[PDB]
Design a protein around this nucleic acid. Structure first.
Lengths: 83, 66, 122, 80, 77
RNA sequence: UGUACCAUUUUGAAUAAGUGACGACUAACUAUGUGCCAGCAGUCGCGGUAAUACAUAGGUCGCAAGCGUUAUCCGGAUUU
RNA sequence: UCUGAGAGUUUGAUCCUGGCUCAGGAUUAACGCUGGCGGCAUGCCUAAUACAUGCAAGUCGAUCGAAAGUAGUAAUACUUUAGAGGCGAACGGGUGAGUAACACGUAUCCAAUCUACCUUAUAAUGGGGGAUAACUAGUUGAAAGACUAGCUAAUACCGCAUAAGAACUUUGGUUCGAAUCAAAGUUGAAAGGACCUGCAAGGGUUCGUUAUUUGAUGAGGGUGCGCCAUAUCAGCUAGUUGGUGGGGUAACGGCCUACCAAGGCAAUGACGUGUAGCUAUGCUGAGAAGUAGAAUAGCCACAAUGGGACUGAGACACGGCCCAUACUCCUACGGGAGGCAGCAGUAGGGAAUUUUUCACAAUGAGCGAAAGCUUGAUGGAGCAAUGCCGCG
């Protein structure tokens, strides 16, 4: 897996499942009609590849890949570990 | 092919309450005897015998039967 | 034997579910139904999606019987339930599609319209 | 063709035989009015050879319109 | 009524009989390999797979997938 | 499709206009009938006694092989 | 900058907050009164209600045997194809019932999939066998049809050989779940037609076919984002969420399955309900945006409904099959044809949506080396002042 850069940096919220983590990306944008800074939150499901594991409260890098399972179409690329 | 002397037209000259319709039915049946399509037992005894004259006299009246 | 106030199912396109006998047509005090006997009936259950309404009294004929009657051949066919088919004011039946088989004990008595809509005749 | 009635205007296009008439087209060759007796097609003759080499042969009616320009005279020798 | 419709129907009735025959010939040898996991059975299975792939009864991707599944089992032996 | 079109081809003003409205809003009015009766009408609002508000005649105004008429959408309405 | 108009209406009279009507453009408009033409577009939003009839995908004899007939002593020449087989049929055609989410609009990733014929060149088109319609005979038969036994050819089917090239496995090597390459193990391709030349042998032109191999192309799958109302809808969800193994559609994937589990979504409003084709686009104002999503162009799906499978490269297939369902029609009553949201046209509805139209002339499509066949796709004509321009 070496596909081109796709940055999906966010904050992981849960890691209850084995090597499966619910990450939370908080994106701030502008209103299409009023242009004010408005934030929205999107959940994602990411699988750990063995060589890299997800720990709660850390910044991560998520990229698209072949679907590992239902609603699991993304993988962990780079992890900024506990701080 | 068909020549002009081979299209003959016949008219049943009478008034009703004379068995005229029954004669017409018999002529049309025996002259229109078709064995393979299903006409045999559907027109074998087609009845315009008068219990209600109007129904048969309307459903069977037409321009010409060939 | 089937009798008056006997609700049985219907076997054609009516929209009804059950229908009961009220009186057997014919001479008085017959009181005993048989195959092919025309009777007066009153619907018991019916959906509006069909072509019948609740509480209406019409005329029908029983075709299949849980009792069973013996035919002149000497071979006695039976059914495990009772089936009736409604007829509209004459030999012509209201329904167009019949469900289940029928018998030949009414072929000699006419009713060719019903058998023309039946799959099997005994 | 398209346009108002009594005015045939057929825009010259490369066609793959699977597409419907005047629908989503691969690439328009140019424009040509059959009524006018004068060559008026806007063709580059370079991308045309590109489509020829990538398949999906366009209409045959323009093949003659390319014989006058000598496209065949160079296409058949560039094939070798 | 379409004449080509009924023509192709009477054609693909026979085609379907033949295709079912070839499919069952494939599956019975697949069972034979499942019983005897050896090189000869795999060779027969792959020959039959190529025969179907030659005409086009089984897509090359499906044939490749099934032969990968079988060759994995043979390699485990 | 003998179509389109063209050529002093021939005769010929001859072969073809109706529509809405005039109290004001918003350019375009006078006569007869009319008695809150008729009726007008998008609004203000008109008519139970000389009605430029109604019905008709005439006049006048504006459109036009179309005119009005309603439905419906944006502007005015920045009246979310 | 593109580009800006107001008036009246409350009161004895005055002002202010607000409302209402008028002043103007447009229709998938129609009604009422009249009514000339040319140019051009448009002409069921209601009943995706039911609908008689003709068309709406047919083609291939240079694929095959054979069948029939016009000439010919026969041979053979001449005309057609009933069938098999081949291509085509999934596209065009039409609607918006249904669909509130990757369906739609858009960019990537496909190290997740394929693509007959078109484009790329290369290995080859080797040798055999068996049936089979067509045809005849018998039976069930009114026919419709169905059953039984012989007769026949193929670019139809089925073994074997060659298979550079290909797939599979193994040894080595490249690179950040996959890449290119050396050797080895294993596996599998067919058919000749037509024409010309040559005494023959043989050779040649084209087509048909297999393998290999380049694009292009269509489809499918995942992706962020935005893309109706609705809180007088607070919990929703059980292959769901996730993992191991296996199977499976072009593929990855509970897609499915064997086992283990307990979470997932969720007051940044899910779930529920009503509505709905969407987009580019049509109109309005200068604009914020609203309006309508006629036609059109693309995308989306069903084809009376609910399902299922097959052929095919691609269909769950406008006029393919089967099953269940509502009806018509015929029936000799044993059983059968089935489904005009294709062009029309009619019953009814409404304000209303039309010839029961010509030719494929032209483009295209489908097919065939071909003369070329079909084409209610497509282009014209007809009706209607529905609308615009010009014109008396």
């Amino acid at each position: 897996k070496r596909n081109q850069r796709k940055v999906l940096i966010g904050i992981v919220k849960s890691t209850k499942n084995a090597k499966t983590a619910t990450v939370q990306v908080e994106s701030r944008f502008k209103h299409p009609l009023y242009h004010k800074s408005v934030v929205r939150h999107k959940k994602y499901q990411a699988h750990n590849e063995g060589e890299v594991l997800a720990k709660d409260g850390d910044k991560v890098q998520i990229v698209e890949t072949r679907p590992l399972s239902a609603t699991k179409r993304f993988r962990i690329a780079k992890i900024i570990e506990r701080a | 092919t068909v020549d002009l002397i081979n299209f003959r037209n016949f008219g049943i000259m009478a008034h009703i309450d004379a068995g005229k319709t029954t004669t017409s039915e018999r002529i049309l049946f025996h002259s229109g005897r078709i064995h393979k399509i299903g006409e045999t037992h559907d027109g074998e005894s087609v009845m315009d015998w008068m219990e209600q004259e109007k129904e048969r006299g309307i459903t069977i009246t037409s321009a010409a039967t060939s | 034997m089937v009798s008056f106030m006997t609700r049985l199912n219907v076997a054609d396109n009516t929209g009804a579910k059950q229908v009961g006998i009220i009186k057997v047509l014919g001479s008085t005090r017959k009181r005993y139904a048989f195959l092919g006997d025309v009777v007066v009936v009153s619907v018991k259950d019916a959906i509006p999606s069909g072509m019948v309404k609740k509480g209406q009294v019409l005329r029908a004929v029983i075709v299949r019987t849980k009792k069973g009657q013996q035919r002149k051949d000497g071979t006695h066919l039976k059914f495990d339930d009772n089936a009736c088919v409604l007829i509209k004011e004459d030999k012509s039946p209201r329904g167009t599609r019949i469900f289940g088989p029928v018998a030949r004990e009414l072929r000699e008595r006419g009713y060719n319209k019903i058998l023309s809509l039946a799959v099997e005749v005994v | 063709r398209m346009g108002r009635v009594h005015y045939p205007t057929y825009r010259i296009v490369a066609v793959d035989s699977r597409v419907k008439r005047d629908g989503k087209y691969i690439a328009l060759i140019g424009h040509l009015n059959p009524a006018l007796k004068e060559n008026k097609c806007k063709i580059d003759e370079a991308v045309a050879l590109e489509w020829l080499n990538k398949g999906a042969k366009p209409t045959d009616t323009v093949r003659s319109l390319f014989s006058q320009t000598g496209l065949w005279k160079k296409f058949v020798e560039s094939k070798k | 009524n379409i004449k080509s419709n009924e023509k192709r129907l009477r054609q693909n009735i026979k085609r379907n009989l033949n295709n079912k025959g070839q499919k069952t010939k494939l599956k019975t040898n697949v069972k034979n390999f499942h019983k005897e996991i050896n090189l000869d059975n795999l060779g027969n299975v792959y020959s039959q797979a190529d025969r179907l792939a030659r005409k086009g009864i089984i897509s090359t991707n499906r044939a490749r997938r099934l032969k990968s599944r079988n060759v994995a089992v043979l390699n485990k032996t």
